[PDB]
Amino acid sequence: KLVPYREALKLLLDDINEIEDTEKVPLREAVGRVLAEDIVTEFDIPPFDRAAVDGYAIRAEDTFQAREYNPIELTVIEEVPAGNVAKEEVTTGKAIKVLTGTRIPKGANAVIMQEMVKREGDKIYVLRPVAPGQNIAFTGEDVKKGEVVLRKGTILRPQDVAMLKALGIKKVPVKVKPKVGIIITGSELIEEPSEEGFKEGKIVETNSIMLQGLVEKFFGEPILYGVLPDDESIIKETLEKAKNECDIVLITDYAHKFVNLLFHGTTIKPGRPFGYGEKVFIMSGYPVSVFAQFNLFVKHALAKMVGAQNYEVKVKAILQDDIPSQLGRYEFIKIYYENGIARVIKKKGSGILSSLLASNAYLEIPEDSEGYRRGEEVWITLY
Template sequence: MFISELLPVKEAFKLLDENQKLTSEETIDLINAHGRVNSRRLTSKLDSPPFDKAAMDGYAIKAEDTFQARADNPIKLKVIDAISAGNVSNVKVRNGEAIKIATGAPIPEGADAVIMEEYTNQEGNEIEVLQPTSPGENIAPKGEDIKAGETILEPGTVMRPQELAITASAGYNTIKVYKKPRVKIIITGDELIEPGTKPGPGKIINSNKYSLKALVESAKASPTVEHSPDNPKILKEKIEEAIRGYDMIITTGGTAISKGDIVVDTVDKLGQIIFHGVAIRPGKPLAFGLIEDKPVFMLSGYPVAAMVQFDIFVRYYLLRMQNINYEHELVERICQRKTPSRLGRTDYIRAFTDDKIAESILISGSGVIKSMVKSNSYIVIEENTEGIDKNSKCNVILFDSFKI
């Protein structure tokens, strides 16, 4: 299959958006929800905290008893009970009295403040209060964090530790989330062998197997990887099997514009090619299609090109499958080298970037993995820009921005 014209990057994203698929929902235990994407608006089932509680270790008191307290004129109060966290007191605090209280314990009836322990001296069953306390001081009121009925999470929220905490506090032990996309990665090529084996004539090690599995996992999806020889019949069978059991297929190899490459032709026969060829460097042979309404990304066999294609296009699509409103985040830096480009093509230049400058990696080539190891970012040169001069501003995508 041949392509007649390379698609601009913006057009490729437009076609991806027009053909975006979403995964369905599932209910999981909250303890297993870290990193998952909440699929429902959640409202709190209760107030948190559910009662007025002590914010500090100290003594529950009536604040008015301490208004005249000074270090040189302490006020004495009688200690009538003690409350530890998880317990309550049935004793009412009256003027001249105090109840020893631990952080998190419910405020007893009659008390309206907590004096911190370090501002007291204890003598038997009495304390000396060394400074005044205001009403409400060191008390976390009922519903201070969240109130019953309050919205705590919107759909599409990635569950970080803090979201897990507030969801638990709101009374949930299970939540509905978007299912992780199940992704079948099919690495094609008769030339590929596994690491640990010395390559014979014409053979190379299958590094894409390891990089793509990790990349899919980094986009919160569940990958399975297998190898296919360059045999149209075998490849067709593997793709048909994958369509039955997975939400997405990613292939590598067999996308270049030549008669010997088979992946694009096979996908075209089984479904529909939405586009084949994007005006980018590296990775212009990128193809995208649908088979039985399931997305198929056809990546280059070159390791660096495949990584760039994944980072820019597949990651975007995979995260949006989980209802994450993901967009690539561009930051501005000063370019340390003169970096040429060609009009009509968007370049993703491997670079090392700090908080001020971006320096392109001099090692190049779609198969030179070392260039990715030395990089932490892409300098993005848009299609209507004819390169970047040294010490000029440039737009950068940091690899760290891919973390969701």
């Protein structure tokens, strides 16, 4: 009995734990890494209340009864030079000329733009009510002291790394990349395309390099154990992989002889013969089928191991073509998404890699669905 996808994904992921180990990596090599913990700032940015404009630091309260025909008069007791601090305080009926960046003087809770008042000698005139906090960049308006600026599980981008430099963090704590073993199997398989190779019925090996890239794309460090022949004794070095690594992936007698399996034979299509047990992922050998198995299983296991958040994008799209679907089978459907439209790539059928190249995304159709019509809106996952 093929086990449904959602049951298989739960059995698999419940077996997988978040790796504990962390390490400090420099800002220059931090992009794409997963934060091990919350990052809390020990600094206010900006560190003090600043004038957002060249103006006069006043009391907002003093101008509440200000109109065009009732000008409130204030007296300018000081003008703070560039990069200085006000020596005098602000009391009722007073004002202190400041520049942008200048610390708001004691007493003041607002700043009025220079041009919005009439400068007659040592007096200024305000014609409209000024709000409390007007033109003040308050302390910590960017980030406040003791505030979480980046959550655990965040996948760092350039703007995140810049915030880290703003907080004075030279080397940021991130999760250690899960080591993922890769064993290819098949006496059929060969490293290079050649004439004599084709005459002896050999096909070029492709899943190794594809899985290396896919593991590196999703938080892991791939470790190659190479292509092996169909030989029980030599495949028993899967034990070396389980010791050396957190999880291990192997490509296509029987597979229960090497692994104690939670499941084997699943509902997905392609990728039906997928199984898993003891950190070992049994994969299908044909590129299209390995890709679907990676996105539906491996991708989510790796994300759980580093606690990755927001590691995939779901997009709403109008479906271009009909997708008829088998009941009892969870369809992995390759999509090329452009201009809000999901165009279905249909192909085969011998691990024919070109459909992977022409696709942008995938759509998942549950077992209880007979398919979708063109015009129906669908949710897809970007590669």
